[PDB]
């Protein structure tokens, strides 16, 4: 539903969520900048790479303002982000599709629509499968009636979805995870009138998001091995980070 009794963490997360129009304008302006266009590639490719990069910039900016995360040192933050970057980006795309859903197309962060036929005829089988599976996930989330509260809560959960042994500040992160799960469970139990464990189902959705993220990493890696990615690409730097 809406919210008479929403967990404090979820409310604070709602207040920590950036404005869509501002981010859109910022990324657009960041794309408007001149660039050394490669003659052996469609410029749209580089523009989309830069787009994803800027999206991740905004995501990082969102992370920096988050509770618990801002109480962490640089190392832990870098580890977490290097662990959940693709997941955060993918989930961002997915929820962007959920919030503004036209089944015949996908909506980019810039605001431009891309029909599924275009993807089906112009993209490779891998990216096609990625978009299709992501759209299936979008359909599932729409079926579960996902709201903004559960969205930001799930983002926060994703941000700290990592084994504790790779982090220096153990107890704090543990508290963050437990509090996050407790918040999600509380909200879902207090607001979902339908049947089924919405909490567990959302966790499954998170698993699917993770696998999808793995596939995305695989795609970016394929582009990387073919020297198709622009130099100093942020996502490639995140991909080349030491895995935890």
């Amino acid at each position: 539903s809406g919210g008479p009794n929403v967990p404090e963490l979820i409310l604070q997360l709602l207040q920590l969520e950036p404005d869509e129009d501002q981010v859109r304008a910022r990324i657009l302006g960041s794309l408007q900048e001149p660039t050394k266009s490669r003659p052996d590639q469609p410029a749209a490719f580089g523009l989309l790479c830069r787009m994803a990069d800027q999206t991740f910039i905004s995501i990082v900016d969102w992370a920096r303002r988050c509770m618990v995360f801002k109480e962490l040192e640089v190392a832990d933050q870098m580890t977490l982000l290097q662990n959940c970057w693709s997941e955060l980006l993918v989930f961002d795309h997915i929820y962007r599709q959920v919030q503004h859903g036209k089944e015949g197309s996908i909506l980019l962060v810039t605001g431009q629509e891309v029909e599924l036929t275009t993807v089906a005829t112009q993209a490779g089988s891998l990216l096609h499968s990625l978009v299709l599976r992501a759209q299936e996930l979008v359909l599932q989330l729409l079926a579960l009636q996902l709201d903004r509260q559960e969205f930001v809560c799930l983002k926060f959960i994703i941000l700290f979805s990592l084994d504790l042994k790779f982090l220096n500040n153990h107890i704090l992160v543990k508290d963050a995870q437990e509090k996050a799960n407790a918040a999600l469970l509380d909200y879902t139990l207090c607001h979902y009138p339908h049947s089924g464990d919405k909490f567990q189902q959302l966790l499954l959705c998170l698993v699917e998001v993770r696998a999808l993220s793995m596939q995305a990493k695989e795609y970016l890696y394929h582009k990387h091995l073919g020297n198709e990615m622009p130099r100093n690409n942020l996502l490639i730097e995140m991909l080349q980070a030491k895995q935890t």
């Binding site: 910039i57 990082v60 900016d61 920096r64 303002r65 640089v74 933050q77 870098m78 982000l81 290097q82 100093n232 942020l234 730097e237 995140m238 980070a241």
Partner: peptide
Amino acid sequence: PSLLKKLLLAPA
């Protein structure tokens, strides 16, 4: 060294 570290150390 890394753009990520620069981002995390950037002014807020």
